[PDB]
Design a protein around this motif. Structure first.
Motif, PDB file in Angstrom:
ATOM      1  N   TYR A 186       0.845  -1.225   0.000  1.00 31.13           N
ATOM      2  CA  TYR A 186       0.000   0.000   0.000  1.00 31.13           C
ATOM      3  C   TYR A 186       0.868   1.259   0.000  1.00 31.13           C
ATOM      4  N   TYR A 212       3.159   2.164  -2.228  1.00 32.43           N
ATOM      5  CA  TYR A 212       3.252   2.762  -3.587  1.00 32.43           C
ATOM      6  C   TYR A 212       1.888   2.795  -4.287  1.00 32.43           C
ATOM      7  N   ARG A 213       1.306   1.630  -4.597  1.00 31.68           N
ATOM      8  CA  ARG A 213       0.003   1.642  -5.317  1.00 31.68           C
ATOM      9  C   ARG A 213      -1.039   0.778  -4.599  1.00 31.68           C
ATOM     10  N   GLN A 214      -2.097   1.413  -4.104  1.00 32.07           N
ATOM     11  CA  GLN A 214      -3.233   0.733  -3.423  1.00 32.07           C
ATOM     12  C   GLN A 214      -4.022  -0.106  -4.439  1.00 32.07           C
ATOM     13  N   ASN A 215      -4.184   0.430  -5.652  1.00 30.27           N
ATOM     14  CA  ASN A 215      -5.006  -0.165  -6.744  1.00 30.27           C
ATOM     15  C   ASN A 215      -4.505  -1.529  -7.238  1.00 30.27           C
ATOM     16  N   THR A 254      -7.355   4.677  -2.345  1.00 30.37           N
ATOM     17  CA  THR A 254      -6.198   4.726  -3.284  1.00 30.37           C
ATOM     18  C   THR A 254      -5.258   5.859  -2.854  1.00 30.37           C
ATOM     19  N   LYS A 255      -4.894   6.748  -3.781  1.00 32.37           N
ATOM     20  CA  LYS A 255      -3.998   7.884  -3.439  1.00 32.37           C
ATOM     21  C   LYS A 255      -4.702   8.738  -2.382  1.00 32.37           C
ATOM     22  N   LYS A 308      -4.330  12.211   0.702  1.00 34.01           N
ATOM     23  CA  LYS A 308      -3.790  13.550   1.093  1.00 34.01           C
ATOM     24  C   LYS A 308      -3.788  14.540  -0.080  1.00 34.01           C
ATOM     25  N   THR A 309      -3.119  14.217  -1.195  1.00 37.84           N
ATOM     26  CA  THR A 309      -3.081  15.158  -2.349  1.00 37.84           C
ATOM     27  C   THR A 309      -4.516  15.390  -2.837  1.00 37.84           C
ATOM     28  N   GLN A 333     -11.196  10.891 -11.406  1.00 32.74           N
ATOM     29  CA  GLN A 333      -9.868  10.299 -11.095  1.00 32.74           C
ATOM     30  C   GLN A 333     -10.025   9.220 -10.022  1.00 32.74           C
ATOM     31  N   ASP A 335      -9.179   5.078 -10.132  1.00 38.19           N
ATOM     32  CA  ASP A 335      -8.171   4.631  -9.135  1.00 38.19           C
ATOM     33  C   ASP A 335      -8.626   3.409  -8.325  1.00 38.19           C
TER      34      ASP A 335
END
Lengths: 48, 206, 193, 51
Positions: free
Chosen positions: B181, B183-186, C11-12, C14-15, C73, C77
């Motif tokens: 997790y 780097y990439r969660q997906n 997924t990603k 904070k940003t 997005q 993701d």
């Protein structure tokens, strides 16, 4: 004078509520005016 | 006096002068045993009733999770139905099922096989059930994160002791995939085929 | 106000939240301009308020345009029907009418396409698994050790539960996504399985 | 945690519509309006009588 009584039913208002009751009260007030034209008959400046 | 059917999980409780073992298995019961004094059966006997109320059904527990950070007070148990039940040992009352996990939205399609919590953070623990393993927080009934879906079924998944971010799940297709997790969660960090034969279990050294 | 409270954490991280935080602040900044309300007070005679409204209308559209981009997005993701659906529930009351709504229609077809892959994957897995269960072969689909005849029914239920979890969520979607021919085709495949 | 709160609002939403909106709600309102109109008509006749 009839309109003045209608105005009192509006002038008296303390600007609290009224619309939730006035909207219901609007239909009868409109109906009285309809009746007023017929009763007079010879009323001058009816369109005015 | 031993619990009926095959033993599902066997773990050692480290919070004692003398090592003690807690066993959870397919009869829907959970027992705590004393190594020094086996005597007449386990010291504590608990049946995993589900839903409380007036409807009681005994469901076998396929996974037992115990951690030092969690301590002796909290025991994590995964039932055959797919729900997870936490039993808290009390001096005052013999056993209490304090929290029921995924009773409504977290129920697994298949029985939970492995329940583990990352060494770095005790609060977050991931349970590997059926096609996709899920991660749940200590006070939330629903799973915080559900990761994809997998070919066949995941026999066992364990958190990396050294790094909290990456956890490894071994599928029943003979393929082991590492989920990172950081780097990439997906997507899976990488997928490796250990052997043609299905992988029954995975253990990481500490 | 609801948008600020949202904490998707998918997924990603904070940003995306920082961009969302700026958008919430952007709305507050517009309120401070409109919020100050020098004169105005919704006068019917004053047309100054109407000019402010048009300027405010552009600001809401700018706020909505940014939300569409961040929302699109996030959907890409997650990469899973369950993950994408969870994001929709968070923004369920945050849809900005027609602006956000147009983006949602594009999102719905993509979600339907994902369910097609899961249905095909379950079916393909089912066919390979079904032959092993009948012959009671080693490394069979049934988990650990269980009665073989009893296990097949339990195994069928697990596959059945996975297939029907999305259908309840799918019935939730509005704007007649049911009418869409692609949605109907997936439903026919689900019934056959 | 936010999703559960949003889920709770949806349950409340079904209850608000079931409670606030009832079968023939407009018909009950219309009957009340008709009674007010009849009372107003009687008053207008009395107003016409005084001159």
């Amino acid at each position: 004078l009839f309109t003045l009584k209608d105005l009192f039913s509006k002038l008296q208002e303390s600007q609290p509520s009224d619309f939730p009751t006035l909207y219901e009260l609007f239909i009868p007030i409109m109906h009285t005016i309809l009746l007023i034209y017929n009763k007079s008959k010879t009323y001058n400046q009816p369109p005015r | 006096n031993s619990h009926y059917e095959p033993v599902t999980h066997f773990h050692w409780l480290m919070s004692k002068t003398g090592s003690e073992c807690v066993t959870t298995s397919t009869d829907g019961k959970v027992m705590w045993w004393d190594t020094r004094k086996f005597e007449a059966g386990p010291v504590e006997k608990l049946n995993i009733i589900e839903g409380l109320g007036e409807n009681e059904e005994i469901i076998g527990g396929t996974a037992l999770e115990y951690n030092v950070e969690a301590g002796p007070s909290k025991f994590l148990i995964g039932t055959e139905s797919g729900s997870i039940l936490t039993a808290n040992k009390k001096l005052k009352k013999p056993v209490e099922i304090t929290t029921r996990y995924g009773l409504d939205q977290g129920r697994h399609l298949g029985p939970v096989y492995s329940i583990n919590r990352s060494n770095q953070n005790p609060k977050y623990f991931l349970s590997v059930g059926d096609w996709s393993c899920k991660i749940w927080v200590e006070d939330l009934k629903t799973p915080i994160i559900r990761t994809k879906y997998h070919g066949s079924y995941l026999s066992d998944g364990c958190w990396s002791p050294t790094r909290s971010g990456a956890f490894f799940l071994v599928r029943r297709d003979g393929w082991m995939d590492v989920w990172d997790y950081y780097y990439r969660q997906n997507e899976i960090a990488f997928s490796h085929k250990v052997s043609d034969s299905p992988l029954t279990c995975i253990k990481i050294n500490q | 106000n609801k948008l600020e409270k949202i904490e998707l954490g998918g997924t990603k991280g904070k940003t995306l939240t920082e961009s969302i935080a700026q958008i919430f602040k952007e709305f507050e900044e517009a309120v401070q301009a409109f919020t100050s309300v020098s004169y105005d007070i919704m006068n019917i005679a004053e047309k100054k308020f109407d000019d402010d409204f048009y300027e405010f209308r552009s600001k809401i559209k700018e706020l909505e345009r940014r939300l569409a981009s961040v929302i699109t997005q996030g959907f890409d993701d997650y990469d899973t029907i369950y993950g994408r659906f969870k994001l929709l529930d968070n923004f369920e009351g945050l849809l900005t009418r027609p602006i956000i709504a147009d983006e949602l229609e594009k999102k719905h077809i993509v979600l339907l396409e994902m369910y097609k892959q899961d249905l095909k994957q379950v079916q393909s897995i089912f066919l390979e698994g079904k032959q092993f269960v009948d012959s009671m072969h080693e490394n069979a689909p049934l988990f650990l050790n269980m009665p073989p005849i009893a296990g097949a029914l339990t195994w069928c239920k697990s596959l059945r539960d996975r297939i029907q979890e999305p259908i309840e969520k799918l019935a939730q979607l509005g704007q007649g996504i049911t009418e869409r021919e692609e949605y109907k085709d997936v439903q026919k495949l689900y019934t056959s399985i | 945690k936010n999703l559960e709160t949003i889920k709770k609002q949806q349950e409340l939403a079904k209850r608000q519509v079931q409670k606030d909106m009832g079968s023939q709600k407009e018909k009950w309102e219309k009957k009340k309006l008709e009674m007010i109109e009849t009372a107003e008509a009687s008053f207008h006749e009395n107003l016409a009588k005084n001159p």
